[PDB]
């Protein structure tokens, strides 16, 4: 699972090396930046349902055709699954803030997503709009510090880029 420390260990093992100066220096980066990303992780852990709910609401407001007969937000089962999916993306973002790399989002969200949505006939634009709303919504210092918000916003843009 990709993080600061797993990346330097994999590089060291490929060359047969003990941890050296540049490996320890990399991990010092994690010690310094952890305060920002862990602040974001804590705010998201405590408020994930409301954050997901308003991002889901925005994507339906942009695309009301989804409520029409036969479309992807039209039944009670479909509505519940779409909100669930937006919450899954935010949970994997929470995990990625904890780890300090994109690993949890890469392995459990992004891998396979295009194949699943194509098989089920789900459009990608509502996913992009949910994440886009979440990316433009936060401000500092109200919601979290400026550097906490920089970390949260970077992961939202990483998920948007994977769908675009």
């Amino acid at each position: 699972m990709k993080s600061v420390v797993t990346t330097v260990i994999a590089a060291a093992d490929a060359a047969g090396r003990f941890p050296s100066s540049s490996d320890l220096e990399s991990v010092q980066g994690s010690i310094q930046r952890s305060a920002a990303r862990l602040e974001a992780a804590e705010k998201l852990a405590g408020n994930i349902d409301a954050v997901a709910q308003e991002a889901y609401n925005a994507c339906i407001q942009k695309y009301p055709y989804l409520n029409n007969s036969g479309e992807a937000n039209s039944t009670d089962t479909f509505k519940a699954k779409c909100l669930r999916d937006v919450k899954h993306y935010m949970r994997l973002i929470q995990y990625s803030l904890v780890v300090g790399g994109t690993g949890p989002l890469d392995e459990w969200g992004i891998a396979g997503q295009r194949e699943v949505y194509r098989a089920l006939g789900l459009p990608t634009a509502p996913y992009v709009e949910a994440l886009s709303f979440a990316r433009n919504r936060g401000c500092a210092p109200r919601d979290m510090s400026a550097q906490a918000l920089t970390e949260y916003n970077a992961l939202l843009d990483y998920a948007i880029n994977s769908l675009s």
């Binding site: 699972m1 420390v5 994999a10 490996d23 862990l38 804590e42 949970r91 780890v99 949890p104």
Partner: protein
């Protein structure tokens, strides 16, 4: 491979839940500098550790360096020194990550079976790993003895606390104990 934080994420995902204990993550980070000291203390003394451990295994069992012994002839002594260093390398990766997965997956899986097919003696392998476990403890605490140093003593000069990093000594000792369990 996993690290201490990605381990916690796997556990949270088994109930599709957010990671809620921010206090415990924070204390891990608060010990991060002492962790980097601990890794520096092993890596910086590795050659001396390996050669002293393999020599100690031998001085305690002279059968290894006579006809039919598993450190005879030169090629076998050299393979043994190589293996003691590989094992210490993977133990140091686990200490850096704060999780045993790299050690289990890249070093220990299938090692017992490999050794059984070659006739590499288990008792002797375990003794070398025991000597390295003791050496690592002393270097992490920055209390190696002159009696054991063979005139090659090193001091690390890290800021002293009363416990001398007892938590990290226990953690490092646990990874050596995983190697011993795997080969026994």
């Amino acid at each position: 491979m996993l690290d201490a934080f990605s381990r916690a994420v796997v556990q949270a995902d088994a109930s599709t839940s957010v990671v809620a204990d921010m206090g415990a993550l924070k204390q891990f980070i608060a010990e991060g500098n002492r962790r980097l000291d601990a890794v520096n203390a092993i890596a910086s003394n590795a050659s001396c550790m390996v050669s002293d451990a393999v020599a100690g295994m031998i001085c305690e069992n002279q059968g290894l360096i006579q006809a039919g012994g598993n450190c005879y002839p030169n090629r076998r002594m050299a393979a043994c020194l190589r293996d003691a260093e590989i094992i210490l390398r993977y133990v140091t990766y686990a200490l850096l990550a704060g999780d045993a997965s790299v050690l289990d997956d890249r070093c220990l899986n299938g090692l017992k079976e490999t050794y059984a097919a070659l006739g590499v003696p288990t008792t002797s392998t375990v003794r070398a790993v025991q000597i390295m476990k003791a050496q690592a403890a002393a270097h992490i605490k920055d209390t190696p003895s002159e009696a054991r140093a063979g005139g090659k003593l090193r001091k690390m000069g890290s800021p002293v606390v009363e416990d001398r990093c007892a938590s990290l000594v226990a953690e490092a000792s646990s990874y050596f104990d995983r190697v011993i369990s795997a080969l026994s």
